């Protein structure tokens, strides 16, 4: 229906509706990105042209997964889809997929710049992360790689959780992920929030490991070696015997680690940075914590519609994944 124009960008021919003006390259894995001006909405937007979206079953399923996820995320603190389009007029000529979202200019690293933030500022940032995480977790989604480069912040200081980094590490990963534990709790993301929050308060990386083993060494020095109740839950005979062969490190007193911080911030960090994932605070519980008193609104922390992820178990042909992807493009409804 819209009128499309062609322009060579990022060494390929882009073909976009005329509403998207002044395409300029932003960078080029999954695809190449341009910034543009959406004349229909007056928004600066980023347009991603997926690369080789249906070259293989793996590519095709990944394309479907990404479009399904972006179409489902409708929350102020999560990246959302402004538009998705293809120049194709039919399924038969469907080969290219373009995704459109708000143009973001800064991630959390750009806002922090290795500085201590004010406590009020930390409250506001962590509150928004937890608000978005409550939504994501309510859809039975685990982020699994939350970190400052995956958190965008606009000029109003509204934060959005991304599943990508902007155009130009393991320091924020939960310990069970670095041990390939599987059976991951949604609180692997809460661990990451604790690492981020600590960094916002101190201006320093909490666990700046040099490699995988160093990362775990640094974690255990803060939170201690596994206690008795955690050791009961370790089925791996190899993990058990190695853990008990280590000298016991006590859990440090967080009040004497984050000296000068808000005692409520310290209490919340103590509830996020627990080795046992079953004992970590959830996102919804964290939002009710006294630390966020000035921002918490129990009636404006919404949850997601149910999210059907049954396609993850399916082994389909390329043309089937492509057809399901085409259905999702055709059915897309722009947000208000
Ligand atoms: C024109 O003003 C700017 C001036 C300077 C400048 O820095 C060079 C930037 C860059 C800011 C930026 O990168 N902004 C941005 C990116 C995305 C991304 S980044 C990605 N993948 N990662 C990836 C891809 C290629 C290269 C590096 C990293 N995907 C999407 C994305 C995801 C879904 C969509 F629907 C659309 C785009 C989304 C929104 N804003 C801008
Ligand atoms: C001059 C720089 C680009 C300006 C905006 C082009 C906007 C296209 O906008 C679209 O144009 C279509 C054709 O008129 C109309 O049918 C649509 O209603 C209108 O939204
Ligand atoms: C768009 C929604 C962002 C918040 C939800 C992230 C949900 C988990 O999204 C993650 O995205 C990564 C992208 O490389 C994938 O590699 C991971 O497998 C996936 O779990
Ligand atoms: C030296 C061992 C260091 C890491 C101990 C990490 C314990 C994380 O916690 C564990 O996470 C598992 C996976 O979600 C859950 O199934 C367990 O019940 C939970 O206790």
From Swiss-Prot:
UniProt modification remark: Dual phosphorylation can also be mediated by TAB1-mediated autophosphorylation. TCR engagement in T-cells also leads to Tyr-307 phosphorylation by ZAP70. Dephosphorylated and inactivated by DUPS1, DUSP10 and DUSP16. PPM1D also mediates dephosphorylation and inactivation of MAPK14. Acetylated at Lys-48 and Lys-147 by KAT2B and EP300. Acetylation at Lys-48 increases the affinity for ATP and enhances kinase activity. Lys-48 and Lys-147 are deacetylated by HDAC3.
GO cellular component terms attached to this protein's record: cytoplasm; cytosol; extracellular region; ficolin-1-rich granule lumen; glutamatergic synapse; mitochondrion; nuclear speck; nucleoplasm
Keywords: Acetylation, Apoptosis, ATP-binding, Cytoplasm, Kinase, Nucleotide-binding, Nucleus, Phosphoprotein, Serine/threonine-protein kinase, Stress response, Transcription, Transcription regulation, Transferase, Ubl conjugation
Domain of life per record: Eukaryota
Ribonucleoprotein found in the keyword field: no
Sites of Phosphothreonine modification: 12, 247
Modified residues (Phosphotyrosine): 307
Means of activity regulation: Activated by cell stresses such as DNA damage, heat shock, osmotic shock, anisomycin and sodium arsenite, as well as pro-inflammatory stimuli such as bacterial lipopolysaccharide (LPS) and interleukin-1.
Entry-linked SMART domains: S_TKc (SM00220)
Tissue: Brain, heart, placenta, pancreas and skeletal muscle. Expressed to a lesser extent in lung, liver and kidney.
A Pfam family annotated for this UniProt entry: Pkinase
EC number from the UniProt entry: 2.7.11.24
Active site: 163 (proton acceptor)
Domain comment in the entry: The TXY motif contains the threonine and tyrosine residues whose phosphorylation activates the MAP kinases.
The protein's name: Mitogen-activated protein kinase 14
Organism: Homo sapiens
